[PDB]
Design an enzyme around this catalytic site. Structure first.
Site, mmCIF file in Angstrom:
data_model
loop_
_atom_site.group_PDB
_atom_site.id
_atom_site.type_symbol
_atom_site.label_atom_id
_atom_site.label_comp_id
_atom_site.label_asym_id
_atom_site.label_seq_id
_atom_site.Cartn_x
_atom_site.Cartn_y
_atom_site.Cartn_z
ATOM 1 N N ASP A 139 0.831 -1.229 -0.103
ATOM 2 C CA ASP A 139 -0.194 -0.120 0.035
ATOM 3 C C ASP A 139 0.879 1.185 -0.145
ATOM 4 O O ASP A 139 0.617 2.301 0.830
ATOM 5 C CB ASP A 139 -1.019 -0.048 1.057
ATOM 6 N N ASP A 323 -8.157 -5.189 9.635
ATOM 7 C CA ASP A 323 -7.655 -4.088 8.437
ATOM 8 C C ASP A 323 -7.957 -2.710 9.184
ATOM 9 O O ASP A 323 -7.213 -1.787 8.566
ATOM 10 C CB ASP A 323 -8.667 -4.243 7.240
HETATM 11 O O1 LIG Z 1 -1.868 -7.617 9.796
HETATM 12 C C1 LIG Z 1 -0.726 -7.313 9.143
HETATM 13 C C2 LIG Z 1 -0.589 -5.737 9.108
HETATM 14 O O2 LIG Z 1 -1.889 -5.271 8.470
HETATM 15 C C3 LIG Z 1 -1.851 -3.803 8.407
HETATM 16 O O3 LIG Z 1 -3.050 -3.226 7.695
HETATM 17 C C4 LIG Z 1 -1.715 -3.090 9.803
HETATM 18 O O4 LIG Z 1 -1.429 -1.643 9.659
HETATM 19 C C5 LIG Z 1 -0.480 -3.543 10.482
HETATM 20 O O5 LIG Z 1 -0.652 -3.302 12.011
HETATM 21 C C6 LIG Z 1 -0.512 -5.232 10.759
HETATM 22 O O6 LIG Z 1 0.603 -5.641 11.291
#
Ligand SMILES: OC[C@H]1O[C@@H](O)[C@H](O)[C@@H](O)[C@@H]1O
Length: 372
Positions: A139, A323
């Site tokens: 992202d 998410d």
């Molecule tokens: O779950 C894996 C990752 O996803 C991301 O969307 C989150 O911002 C992180 O905090 C997390 O470690």
């Protein structure tokens, strides 16, 4: 450059398996032995460990020690899968996943120091015994292609390119393979996004090569934290006019554009939340999509992969880690987390969302075989 997945056993992440104990407990409390046993199966499926903040750097050496122990007991060559995910002004076009570094608070320099820490952890005698597959900054660069109208993204564009470049330049080791995140077909697969996507990947690699001569990457990671099928069993209306309507077709679609700019067209494809199609009304719904299921299990089998350009199907986003929060008061509340397709209520991004992974198990496709 060879496919790092061949001849190796991707590492099971113990900390993730431990979080799944809560899911097992839920199923046991419902008297649902089948789904409890299916959750036990998930505990043994390899996933990526995300280095999503500075504190998480401290998990790398314990993970390496664990992997070396497993390698020496089993005789298998382990592949440790990591995500580097901490750019300053992170996830610029949403609020859900804002991180600890910010450009207005020395974030670029802080990011470099964070990378330096990771490099040192990956430079120990034990690290030398292992091989690593590392996804770089989900992202990120996709935002420069489509989201420059968002002020935070316009402001972060240079920092994203320079940050990823520094990371690439810092991780040139014979035992590390790097994959730059390349979003998913519904974002960068549209015809008009293909060339600028390829160009920004090459631009970033070229910046890395200004820091470290002859720097390279293995390729790209696609569908990370998303839900698209590998091969669709019913093309959705929202994908019409997009040749990247499933991730296998995204690979086919993007590949010639990568080749045009001299960027390597090798892919790993997240399928960890791809088992159930038809759960979104719009392709841009990304946050905690209700009734998502675990998808195709990690594999290099060409009978399934059906592409010389695809190194492996993998599970990058660990199912059950949120998410984003649905709490409308939260600083990181993003409206996408209350889309019509979102599972609400949900906790902060990265935090455990037990009800969601309950559904990932139930909705898995192919169904999970129980480990009783
Ligand atoms: O779950 C894996 C990752 O996803 C991301 O969307 C989150 O911002 C992180 O905090 C997390 O470690």
């Amino acid at each position: 450059s060879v496919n790092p997945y061949i001849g190796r056993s991707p590492l099971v992440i113990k900390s993730y398996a431990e979080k799944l104990e809560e899911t097992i407990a839920y199923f046991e409390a419902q008297g649902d032995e089948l789904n409890a046993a299916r959750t036990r199966t998930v505990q043994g499926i390899p996933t990526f460990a995300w280095i999503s903040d500075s504190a998480t750097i401290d998990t790398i050496q314990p993970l390496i020690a664990d992997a070396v122990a497993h390698q020496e007991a089993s005789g298998e060559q382990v592949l440790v899968q990591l995500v580097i995910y901490n750019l300053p002004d992170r996830a610029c076009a949403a609020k859900a996943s804002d991180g600890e570094f910010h450009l207005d608070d020395d974030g670029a320099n802080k990011y470099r120091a964070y990378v330096d820490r990771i490099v040192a952890e990956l430079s120990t005698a034990d690290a030398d015994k292992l091989h690593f597959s590392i996804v770089l900054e989900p992202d990120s660069l996709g935002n420069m292609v489509t989201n420059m109208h968002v002020p935070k993204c316009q402001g972060a564009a240079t920092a994203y390119k320079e940050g990823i470049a520094y990371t690439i330049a810092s991780l040139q080791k014979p035992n590390i393979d790097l994959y730059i995140d390349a979003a998913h077909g519904g974002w960068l697969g549209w015809n008009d996004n293909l060339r600028p996507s390829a160009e920004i990947f090459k631009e970033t690699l070229d910046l890395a090569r200004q820091i470290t001569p002859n720097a390279t990457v293995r390729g790209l990671a696609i569908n990370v934290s998303n839900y698209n099928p590998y091969k669709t069993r019913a093309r959705e209306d929202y994908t019409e006019w997009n040749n990247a309507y499933d991730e296998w077709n995204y690979v086919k679609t993007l590949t010639p554009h990568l080749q045009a700019v001299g960027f390597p067209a090798q892919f790993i494809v997240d399928q960890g939340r791809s088992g159930r199609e038809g759960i979104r009304t719009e392709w841009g719904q990304w946050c905690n999509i209700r009734n998502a299921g675990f998808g195709i299990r990690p594999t290099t089998d060409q009978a399934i992969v059906d592409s010389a350009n695809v190194d492996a199907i993998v599970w990058v986003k660990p199912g059950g880690e949120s998410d984003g929060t649905s709490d409308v008061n939260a600083v990181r509340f993003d409206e996408n987390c209350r889309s019509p397709a979102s599972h609400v209520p949900a906790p902060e991004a990265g935090e455990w969302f037990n009800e969601f992974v309950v559904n990932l198990v139930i909705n898995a496709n192919p169904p999970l075989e129980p480990t009783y």
